[PDB]
Symmetry: D2
Subunit: 494 residues, 4 copies
């Protein structure tokens, strides 16, 4: 039961957020943000650059000074504040769900039922962690009392993508704020609106000035400024593997700030012959087409056992063909437009490469509307490992279906990738589930399911899909600076 | 009561260690390792470079293959092997203590009682972690069974310094091997002998070929080869902040391998007026002069309250003057020579800089012997924050003594550094100890003691002194790759 | 600045709570609950017995059945429910604060600011734990995948006292509900009203029927019925050491249900000569006189160093004499009446005993008003260890001041008790604080403070003061049953 | 590879172990220990009673005094000693393996390869936990520094059974000693020899006097003295559910000492139709017949799905018939004699009762030899839930085979028991394994395996099979007393 959306939600925030105040970029320059469904401009947004980031870092640093409201605040109260933020977000759930769709292109029903639900669940999860991330008392040798203090890492720079604007923001603010840090966030230029509105709610929730600062702008400008800043203690990046490299290099070249990376992938979805056919087909479809295929953990390599290959392919094609593409605000819509023109063109480029390489085009393969960035649900069959569409992240509605024979074989092929963000196994056999779930070199391996995210279960990648983990208790590790205090005592006893 | 050392221990290992075999460099080239006490060459060592590193990485990769002896081995048995290694090291304790001194210069009494004790204690500590670093079963939403697998990160490249050859090796091998990883270790060209011998013991301990591979050689050559290798999953470096940046840069430019850094520092030792004078004076002396002042956490900025300044300085100068400098094999010797000519010259350069800037030279200040790299225990009084000797890591027997008035003042001054490896507070007052230990931005804050390391308590830096932590349970984080496995279940129940 | 209290709150709940419904005792019997300030009956309450408890256990058991709403409910949602319960309690804070005073006698200012604040904090704290008490994935030998499920203990019987009605209820419900258990609670016959109203809010909060059942009644009847019940999986009791013995015996004689006990004590408050006099005096007074001295961890043994003894005693008597005793609803009141006539008489008996034994009565020692159960703040000086008032829990406004000389002496004397719930050390010296906090055999040692409770810090007794802990992460251990699942896999790897 | 056993090992220890010395009972009385294979007396053993226990408790209490060798010892050193004890046991493996069989009756091959291997693994495992059971630093509200100290519980009474003499000793000594506690152990009168010899090794290993005291004797005498002792802080019992209740009552009646219990069971071994027949048959045989059927977690209720019932029974009967019964020192021997005459007769009694109730006797059913306590491997078919042999712990070579149809059916039938120690599920289906492993109310659920014990995985019972857990990290909870130290600080900061 979803409330009726406002298909033209008003924009109240489009500037730079620093010290709980709205500012225009120092240069006074702005950039337009487009509605991917119409190709039309929504509004103008403050284009932050290095000088703006510098202002934000100074505000954050200030808020992190020993004896400041944020440093002196009870850990339990940070939990109250995070829960309050979640309440304000839920209060404006219908509005944000619409604004998310307006700016991003994803179906409103999904923004409402999936996106914001996961935002609330994440913040509320982390509100619980606020006063429970214990340090330790250590049984060190000699007459000493040793213990550790789990302190905040300090000023954290958080750079996020455009595929899940609100959720990606939540995945960052939740753990950072729960551990007492201060942030300077760089939202994606393609989808800055929703995160900016949340900042208004952060001020309403009562978070002290400078605790959270949002700088909307471009990557090589605002982004690089954060990653290279001499006073940024930590940087958390989510985006392309390519920019992940740029981020780590910048950290090493600057002040050696701690780094975590949530990059891309080419996750294999393995379908064994003893799989529940209906279930595997519907799930494999979701595994790839979810969020216009714009998901890092997209099951873009569907390996199907040869015995059930034909039937699986047949049903998959049928399901893809029936997938309703259209205006994201229409409840009938299963797939909206791609985020922007650049992405739209890149996907079309890959589709063309798929055909050129000899991949069997089974359906779709072209534009789905003469307005907006709509692409037809595309399916390629008989894909080979060496093919470009089987190695590179397409980030669109393009499905690769490969055929395999043995379990040993599929393990090697699934693992022969520089990525390793996710993986999936569909089987009814206990031994096969365990054999594969252990053999697969991926951050997350789903069995008889896909895209199952839990604020309590960590998510991150193996190899070049990233480093470090988000969500769960693990998501706190990167936002903590450990201090050992070893005190001399008159006489130590057990 | 140390056993009689063999002042001229024979060298049995001087090559490259790969697959439990000794190999000459592909180029057949060798480099000499010198005895800092005599300036004479001890022997020739195989000079490993990129091609040799590639041989080691291939060996380690092979040893990490699913189904291999190392991957199939019980975690508990890894602990057995680590305890075995420890036994072999304890059997050859006097030999290794002597060889350590021969190649490093540090007093034999210290190599035996301190260095090798801490090696044994670190290895035995981690042997216990081998089968206790549990993953988790998570209470995720929906009908799913979610749990994490704490897998080894993979091929770990480990680059270490020369100040504590054996100890630094242990600090790395302990956690890496305890978690089931394989390594390619690059020992310091100045002190490669002992670590190579330990490799012999690893083979005798029963570790499978390729699990631990050691490549002796230079930094820009062997070291950079490791940090830039496309098949090294993680890299752990300990050394200068300068090279730390090169390491992180190389990681980002290559395969995005995980990185932890244990860099240098300019640690402040704070002496409050209510401190036990005698203890503070002796501890302060040890805090700086320990290991010829060649310790990362050396208390190179001794802040003393104005009320007890004069007396503390007087007593400090007296203690430095009586510090016996001589042949490291002489039981009377408290301080041996600096590791090499480069360090020798660099320290002398800093001493000259101290004088040039107006720092009051109180004692020492020059060469202590016409043979070997001996430098006199030097003390500078009335040091100011802006002076070079008050800002840069001298890494030699040079003590800086500064005067302060208030506790708020010393906090700001102590924290006014791009370093933050350690710190110390000497006071009898409960409130002062707590206030200071909290306020100080250091990775380890010692209260009424200094240089108290515990295999159970984490060690690492804040700011540019590094990232990550070694020792304790934390030492295991960087050597684990988390895998979330979420399985679909008929119906989840609490 | 507390809201004006309704000095005669209306009672809405006075029956037995089962399956979210109100029932009269099967016997139809009722018992009166008295207002200790007036001695007048407030109202009648349903007198539950064995048969009523049998109904409650059946309801609880039913709600705990696999597949039931409560068992299927997401752990995160349990958190939501607990946070909701907390909001309702806060909504009705002014009413509940008043009712707590009317039924218990403690000052309204304290019920509002202290009691209810701690209720909220406890509940919100535990709401956070709901989805974070992870099980483990274990690195067992051989080809097996071993892990542990942290399941609910099941049906938990919870018996609580009357000194902190609301608080004692929260400390029991928070951890139990957060872990997914169902409870059958037996509230103290002296103060049953507030807990009954909270049951109403539990229904309003949305907790499934039978998850929380509350049976008001007497101990030998209702309490024993729960303790000896063949279908209660676990019992958590808080009360006198006497009854704790009865509870553990009952559990052993019945179904071997798991038991944890929070009994009484005779906690020592040690005042060293270098302690801040003003602070020590005010704190020691609070340590004993808090909640009319009706606190399990009251510092009933104030040890003061001989050099500052006379001064401390003099100030203490002055503080006790100025303590305003009166109508708990009058904002001027610091001390209300004892809970009931039984306690009133028991305290009077202890006061007479103290005089009889030769303890120097310094002030008070008699009845404070001719109506209600008010007793004058009493102070006994020169108390000796063998004295009864120095060994037994008085649970009334009767302070015992003992004199000591050395620190070794006081340690032995403080530990010479069968109790060991809490202890306190007042000193400015770092070494004294560490020496004593380690030496003292007490569940909680406060340094330079008293009665500092934190929903995140455990609380429990050493020796006969109890077993198991409450609050903190520790409070969840007793509400969890661990299940090890060891699965056979094709080939185990790290 | 099994070394040749000494069929008549000499006995060196047969007295009471207190303060590292051997004592005769105060009464000078002794009791005989019989060789179950011959019925002949091996030797006389000191008969400890209350007065002896009192001596042992006084010795243990002394060794636990603050400032004592054991209390001051480094946690890591405790680990050294535990590993030392393990080495000494391995040195005397062959001897202890023989003496274990001589006194217990189990096959020597099993005593060597299984029993002593598990002892060694348990000890070495816990040696590792010595310095890793961290306390916590807690984020409490207000200006305070709160942390917890994980202290030893104190004097621990440990009463164990006779089925696994050495192993049961290890399971108790490992966790207790690793946590710094002192023990008073009451070994089974039936098998006291081996435990007394290990006491010798304890002294040789270097454990301080009074740390481990061993009192051989009877239950109602020595055992009850321990459980009822006013100075025993905690009791850990492993035996019959019946005595478990006596133990808990004793603790409640005395000083409210902490209690954990490892009682018996009537564990279900569920074989679904899709199970690997050969494997299920061989494992089910092992599940019951292991250690002459004298195992607490014995799969005494073998449920088999109707479709594979006949085949399963046929094969099981054939396997039971071929099971070689004989002299435990003969390599061919799979099954030795029962521990003693009492068990021998009790088991025969149950066999009679089984026939009486209409259970289909398929094989065995009587005495296997006219000397010693040998019983034929017995199998009963068509067992019904209501039968005595399907409800009571037989603790002998008597197999119960029940037939079932559905999975929902088998869950309720398996759970319909007051016991809940273990359970097993044999199936190839992933969903069935997870459904059953979650549904079964057992402390341990083995999937496609049985009797898989891991020092790292917890073991304990649900319901009346016990409370608390042994092995793994959990095994340390019962041996730790949590102390919370809450210190006032000038100003708390994150
Ligand atoms: N924090 C410490 O423990 C520590 C250790 C060593 C040196 N220092 C500082 O560094 C100075 C001396 O240099 P050093 O040799 O001791 O340290 P370093 O940073 O030069 O080298 C440490 C390790 O890194 C290797 N290495 C060198 N260049 C490398 C490169 N480009 N890429 C990869 N690896 C490389 C070296 O061979 C060695 O194994 C001292 O004067 C002192 O200021 C601090
Ligand atoms: Mg847009
Ligand atoms: Mg050298
Ligand atoms: Mg009352
Ligand atoms: Mg016997
Ligand atoms: Mn981009
Ligand atoms: Mn260098
Ligand atoms: Mn009572
Ligand atoms: Mn018995």
């Amino acid at each position: 039961a979803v409330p009726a959306p406002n298909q033209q939600p008003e924009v109240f925030c489009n500037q730079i957020f620093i010290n709980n105040e709205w500012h225009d970029a120092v240069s006074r320059k702005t950039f337009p943000t487009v509605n991917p469904s119409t190709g039309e401009v929504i509004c103008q947004v403050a284009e932050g650059d290095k000088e703006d980031v510098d202002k934000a870092v100074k505000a954050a640093r200030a808020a992190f000074q020993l004896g400041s409201p944020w440093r002196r605040m009870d850990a339990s109260h940070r939990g109250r504040l995070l829960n309050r933020l979640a309440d304000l977000i839920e209060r404006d759930r219908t509005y944000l769900a619409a604004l998310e769709t307006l700016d991003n292109g994803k179906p409103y029903v999904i923004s409402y039922l999936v996106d914001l639900d996961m935002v609330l669940k994440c913040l509320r999860y982390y509100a619980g962690w606020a006063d429970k991330y214990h340090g330790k008392t250590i049984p060190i040798d000699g007459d000493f009392f040793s213990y550790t203090r789990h302190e905040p890492v300090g000023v954290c720079g958080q750079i996020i993508p455009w595929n899940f604007p609100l959720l990606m923001q939540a995945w960052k603010l939740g753990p950072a704020l729960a551990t007492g840090n201060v942030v300077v966030m760089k939202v994606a230029e393609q989808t800055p609106l929703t995160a900016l509105y949340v900042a208004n709610l952060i001020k309403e929730a009562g978070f002290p000035p400078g605790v959270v600062n949002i700088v909307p702008g471009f990557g090589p400008t605002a982004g690089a400024a954060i990653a290279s800043h001499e006073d940024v203690d930590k940087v958390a990046f989510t985006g392309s593997t390519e920019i992940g490299r740029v981020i780590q290099v910048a950290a090493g070249s600057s002040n050696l700030k701690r780094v975590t990376l949530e990059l891309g992938g080419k996750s294999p979805n393995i379908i064994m012959s003893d799989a529940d056919m209906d279930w595997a087909v519907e799930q494999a479809h979701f595994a790839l087409f979810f969020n216009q295929g714009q998901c890092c953990c997209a099951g873009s390599r569907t390996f199907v056992q040869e015995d059930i290959y034909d039937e699986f392919v047949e049903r998959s094609v049928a399901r893809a063909k029936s997938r309703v593409v259209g205006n994201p605000f229409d409840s009938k819509t299963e797939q909206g437009p791609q985020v922007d023109e650049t992405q739209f063109k890149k996907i079309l480029g890959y589709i063309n490469t798929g055909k050129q390489e000899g991949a069997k085009l089974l359906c779709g393969g072209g534009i789905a509307a003469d307005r907006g960035y709509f692409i037809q649900p595309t399916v390629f069959g008989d894909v080979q490992d060496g093919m470009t569409i089987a190695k590179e992240e397409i980030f669109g509605p393009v499905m690769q279906i490969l055929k395999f024979k043995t379990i040993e074989e599929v393990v090697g092929r699934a693992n022969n990738s520089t990525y390793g963000l996710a993986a999936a196994v569909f089987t009814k056999d206990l031994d096969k589930a365990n054999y594969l779930s252990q053999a697969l070199q991926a951050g997350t391996v789903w069995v008889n399911c896909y895209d199952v995210f839990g604020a309590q279960s960590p998510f991150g990648g193996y190899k070049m899909s990233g480093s470090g983990r988000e969500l769960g208790e693990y998501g706190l590790q990167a936002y903590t600076e450990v201090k050992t205090v070893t005190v001399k005592v008159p006489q130590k006893n057990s």
